[PDB]
Amino acid sequence: SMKLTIPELSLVVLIGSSGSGKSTFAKKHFKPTEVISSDFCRGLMSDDENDQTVTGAAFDVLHYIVSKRLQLGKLTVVDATNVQESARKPLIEIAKDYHCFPVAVVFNLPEKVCQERNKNRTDRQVEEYVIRKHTQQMKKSIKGLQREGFRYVYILNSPEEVEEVVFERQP
Amino acid sequence: SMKLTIPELSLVVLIGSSGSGKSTFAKKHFKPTEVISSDFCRGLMSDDENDQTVTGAAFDVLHYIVSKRLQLGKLTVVDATNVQESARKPLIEIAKDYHCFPVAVVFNLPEKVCQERNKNRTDRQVEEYVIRKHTQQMKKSIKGLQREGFRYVYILNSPEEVEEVVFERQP
Ligand SMILES: O=c1ccn([C@@H]2O[C@H](COP(=O)(O)OP(=O)(O)OP(=O)(O)O)[C@@H](O)[C@H]2O)c(=O)[nH]1
Ligand SMILES: O=c1ccn([C@@H]2O[C@H](COP(=O)(O)OP(=O)(O)OP(=O)(O)O)[C@@H](O)[C@H]2O)c(=O)[nH]1
Ligand SMILES: [Mg+2]
Ligand SMILES: [Mg+2]
Ligand code: NA
């Protein structure tokens, strides 16, 4: 098993390409109400999924809901790609604002693995260019995560490592 | 600052080339008796500095002393290069046996930084090829450290980051 320690009061930031299995992992490891996803927040703004005009407000709404949860001292997982520094930055600030530990959980899987899961998805899909870009972005992000303010940085380097994860909420 | 969390019961494994500032860092951040260096253990076997003829005995002594400390449940810092997996693995296994958390602190500094420091040393110096090799070995080591069994992996990527470090011991 790969034991990843997180404090009871954490902001768990999932980092990974579309198709890297963030939501699947989130559903396996955390309670449904602990998980705030970008899909969910966009859905509050529009029932039209491909509406790129609501993306900003959805980010704002994601940040706000997370802020209020952490404020209440409730462990929260951000289920969004988070492969751009600009997306991670406000989460870190939120975490530090409410004295939570920001934790990065990085799905450092090959692009091919994500591309294939994507094609095999029945719920919703993205175009292949999206995952190519995500994967490059995820990779460029790894080295700097600790410097960004993440107190614990856990890089999962393969499907088997992802599968073997057990969280220990010791602190 | 760069906050690194370590449990009260830790085996803190410093990982860095000769010249990367391990002992300097150890002296700044830890009590002298918490630090066990390969150089100290070698010195118990021989008067000659960096006596390469007693290396195996020196590391045996290091492992023994480290094991006895962890047995007493006392936080220990291993101040050796630890750039080889064969050097790290027994520390991980020692930690696991005494139910302690192994923590990796990696001095991921550019080679030239270490080379420069090396030449200004009054204590002892190594040849350039040694530091080249250590740095290569260190860099190769980084990705797999979590998988090796390190519970927390902290990579310090520049002197600035190294300087900024503050440890938080959660007891
Ligand atoms: O180990 C796994 C994990 C996930 N999957 C499969 O991968 C597909 C994508 O899995 P997810 O829907 O969990 O990916 P994601 O959250 O990272 O994707 P975005 O919302 O960012 O777009 C799903 O169909 C899932 O069943 C596997 O096949 N094996
Ligand atoms: O931030 C620093 C840290 C250290 N140094 C200087 O670099 C030199 C080496 O620093 P150390 O002697 O602490 O390196 P080390 O323990 O990693 O090396 P080995 O035992 O493995 O050989 C020392 O002379 C120190 O003063 C700096 O110039 N700046
Ligand atoms: Mg998802
Ligand atoms: Mg030293
Ligand atoms: Na999973």
Residue A116: C-alpha distances to residues A19, A111, A125, A130 (Å): 8, 9, 11, 13
Buried b (16+ CB within 10 A) or exposed e, A61-85: bbbebbbebbeeebbbbbbbbbbee
Q: Are A73 and A85 within 8 A, CB to CB? A: no
Q: Is B82 in the pocket of ligand 2 (CB under 6 A)?
A: no
Amino acid at B68: K
Tokens of residue A138, six digits = 């995820």
Strands A76-79 and B152-156: unpaired
How far is it, in rounded angstroms, from Cα A135 to Cα A20? 9
Reduced to 3 states (helix: H, G, I; strand: E, B; else coil), residue A123 is coil
Rounded to the nearest 10 degrees, the angle between the axes of helix A38-45 and helix A55-71 is: 120
Q: Is A114 exposed, middle or buried (0-12, 13-18, 19+ CB in 10 A)?
A: buried
Distances (CA, A) of A158 to A22, A23, A25, A42: 13, 16, 13, 29
Mutation probe of ligand 1 site: the residue of A117, A130, A156 with most atoms within 8 A of C-beta: A117
Nearest to A104 by CA among A55, A143, A52: A143
| Residue from the list A5, A143, A146 with its beta carbon closest to the beta carbon of B151 | A5
B121 Cβ closer than 6 Å to some ligand 2 atom = yes
In angstroms, rounded to a whole number, what is the distance separating the alpha carbons of residues B54 and A48? 72
Q: Measuring from atom 29 of ligand 2, which residue has the nearest CA?
A: B21
Centroid of ligand 1 to alpha carbon of A21 (angstroms): 3
Q: Is A23 in the pocket of ligand 1 (CB under 6 A)?
A: yes
Task: Determine the Cα–Cα distance for residues B134 and B155; give it in Å rounded to an integer.
Answer: 16
Determine the Cα–Cα distance for residues A49 and A58; give it in Å rounded to an integer.
12
Q: Establish whether residue A135 lines the binding site of ligand 1, counting it when its CB lies within 6 angstroms of any ligand atom.
A: no
For residues A70 and A91, give the distance between their C-alpha atoms in angstroms, rounded to a whole number.
11
Residue B84, SS3 per DSSP: coil
* Interatomic CA distance for residues A31 and A45, integer angstroms: 24
Q: Distance between CA B118 and CA B131 in Å, rounded?
A: 9
Give the containing element (helix H, strand E) for A35: strand A35-37
Intra-chain end-to-end CA distance of chain A, in Å: 19
Domains along the sequence of chain B with CATH: 1-171 (3.40.50.300)
Ligand 1 atom at minimal distance to the Cα of residue A79:
16
Chain B's closest residue to A108, CA to CA, is B143
Question: What's the CA gap between B124 and A39, in Å, rounded?
Answer: 59
d(CA A65, CA A80) in angstroms, rounded, equals 14
Specify the DSSP class assigned to residue A8. S
**Using only C-alpha atoms, what is the Rg of chain A?**
15
From CA B133, how far away is CA A4, in angstroms rounded?
31
Among candidates B107, B40, B44, B30, which has minimal Cα distance to B76? B30
Per the DSSP assignment, residues forming a β-bridge with B167 are B4
Residues 6+ apart with CB under 8 A from A4: A105, A152, A154, A165, A166, A167, A168
Distance from CA of B134 to the nearest CA of A (A): 20
Contact between A154 and A77 under an 8 Å Cβ cutoff? The reply is no
* DSSP E strand stretches across B8-139: 10-15, 35-37, 76-79, 101-107
- H helix or E strand, kind and range, residue B5: strand B2-7
Query: B157 contacts in A (CB within 8 Å)?
Result: 143, 147
Tell me how far apart the alpha carbons of residues B144 and A125 are, in angstroms, rounded to a whole number: 32
Size of interface A-B (CB pairs under 8 A): 26
Strands (E), A39-160: 76-79, 101-107, 152-156
Q: Please tell me whether residue B103 adopts helix, strand or coil conformation.
A: strand
A29 lines ligand 1 (CB under 6 A): no
Mutate to test the interface with B, among A152, A163, A166 (most CBs of B within 10 A): A152
Q: Gap positions in chain B, given as the residue before each gap (C–N > 2.5 A)? A: none
Q: Which residues pair with B106 in a beta bridge?
A: B15, B155
CA dihedral defined by A103, A78, A4, B11, rounded to 10 degrees? 0
The distance of A154 to chain B (nearest Cα, Å) reads 8
Rounded distance between C-alpha atoms, residue B135 and residue B122, angstroms:
21
